[PDB]
Structure 1
Amino acid sequence: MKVIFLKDVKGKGKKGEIKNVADGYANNFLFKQGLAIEATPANLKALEAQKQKEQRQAAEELANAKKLKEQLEKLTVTIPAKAGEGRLFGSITSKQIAESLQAQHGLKLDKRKIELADAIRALGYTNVPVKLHPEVTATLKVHVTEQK
C-alpha cells in the first residue's frame, strides 16, 4: 500500500510521508476521508513537482537576498537629524532607518528587520547588525548626524 500522505501519520506532516497503511484499510479510511492519494504515477510526479517549486522559491530568495546583500553591505548608511552634541532630540528608530534608506538610497528593506537593543541617539558612526534573510543578513555601517 503506497500511502500518499496529505497531513498526519502523527499530526499533519504532509511531507514525503507515504506509509504502508495497508490495503482497503488505509485506503478507505484515510483517503476516502480525504487526506491524500495513492502513488498515482501522477502524484509521485506531483510531489517531486511542487517540492521542486518550493525549492525554486527557497534558493531563489536566497538570491534576491544576496544581491541586495553585497550591494548594501558595501554602501554607507547616511542619516541626517537634529540634536545637541551626542544624542538627537527625537531618537533614531530604524523605522526611521527604512523610511530614510529606502527614501534616499533607493532600496526597499523592512523594519522588523535589523537587530536593535533599541533606538539609538549618539550620532553617526555606530553600525547595526541587521538581520535580512534567515541565515545571512548584513552587519552594516550607520552614520547619523545633527545636520545641526
Structure 2
Amino acid sequence: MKVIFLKDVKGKGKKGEIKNVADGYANNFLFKQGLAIEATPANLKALEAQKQKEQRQAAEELANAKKLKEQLEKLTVTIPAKAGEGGRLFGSITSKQIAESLQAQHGLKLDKRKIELADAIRALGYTNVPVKLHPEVTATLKVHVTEQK
C-alpha cells in the first residue's frame, strides 16, 4: 500500500516521502500514530501543491536576500558616540544600536541576530560588519562611529 509519510522519516518527511508500506500494518500503526496517510490521488496532488509552494517560497526568499544584500552594500550606518581616551568609547556600540540606526536612517528593519558582530565596537572609526541575510547570502554593512557632544 502506497503511503504519504507525514512525520517519522529524516526528521519530518512530511515534504512528501511517498513509500509503499504494508497495508494493514500501515493502517494499524503508521495511520495510527499520524505518521503516514493514504496515498489517494487527491492527497497525492494536494501534497504536490505544498511541495510546489515550499519550493516557490524558498526561491522568493533567496531572491529577496540577494536584492537586500545590494541595498545594504551601498549604505553607511552612522552611530555617533561619546569617546575620550584616544578615540576609545565610553560604552560600546552593539548589534541593537546598529540595527536601530539602520532602521532610523535607511528605512530597513533587520533582525539584530543577522548582524554578525563579534566583540562590541569600542572605538571611533569605520567597521565593516557581516550580515547573514540567508544560509548562502552575507552582505557587508559599513558602520561609521563618530564622536559626539
For Structure 1 versus Structure 2, the TM-score category normalised by the shorter chain is 0.7 to 0.9
Alpha carbons 1:78, 1:142 under 8 Å: kept: yes
Bigger share in strand:
2
TM-score by length of 2: 0.86
Give the C-alpha shift of residue 13 in structure 1: 2.9
Give the C-alpha shift of residue 93 in structure 1: 0.8
TM-score by length of 1: 0.86
Give the C-alpha shift of residue 96 in structure 1: 0.7
Give the C-alpha shift of residue 17 in structure 1: 2.1
Alpha carbons 1:87, 1:123 under 8 Å: kept: yes
CA RMSD of aligned residues (A): 2.0
| Sequence identity percentage | 100
Alpha carbons 2:72, 2:140 under 8 Å: kept: no
Give the C-alpha shift of residue 140 in structure 1: 2.4
Closer/same/farther in 2, CA of residues 113 and 32 from structure 1, 3 Å limit: closer
SS of equivalent to 2:92: coil
Alpha carbons 1:21, 1:27 under 8 Å: kept: no
* Alpha-carbon separation, structure 2, partners of 1:118 and 1:146: 20
Alignment: residue pair count: 148
Give the C-alpha shift of residue 70 in structure 1: 0.2
* Alpha-carbon separation, structure 2, partners of 1:106 and 1:14: 38
* Alpha-carbon separation, structure 2, partners of 1:38 and 1:91: 58
* Alpha-carbon separation, structure 1, partners of 2:131 and 2:33: 47
Alpha carbons 1:73, 1:138 under 8 Å: kept: yes
Closer/same/farther in 2, CA of residues 120 and 32 from structure 1, 3 Å limit: closer
Alpha carbons 1:129, 1:138 under 8 Å: kept: yes
Alpha carbons 2:16, 2:48 under 8 Å: kept: no
Closer/same/farther in 2, CA of residues 92 and 33 from structure 1, 3 Å limit: closer
Q: Which whole-Å deviations, capped at 9, do the CAs of 1:75-128 have from their partners, x for residues lacking one?
A: 222221111251221211121111111112211111112222221112221211
Alpha carbons 1:7, 1:35 under 8 Å: kept: yes
Confirm whether residue 78 of structure 1 aligns to residue 78 of structure 2. Answer: yes
Closer/same/farther in 2, CA of residues 52 and 72 from structure 1, 3 Å limit: same
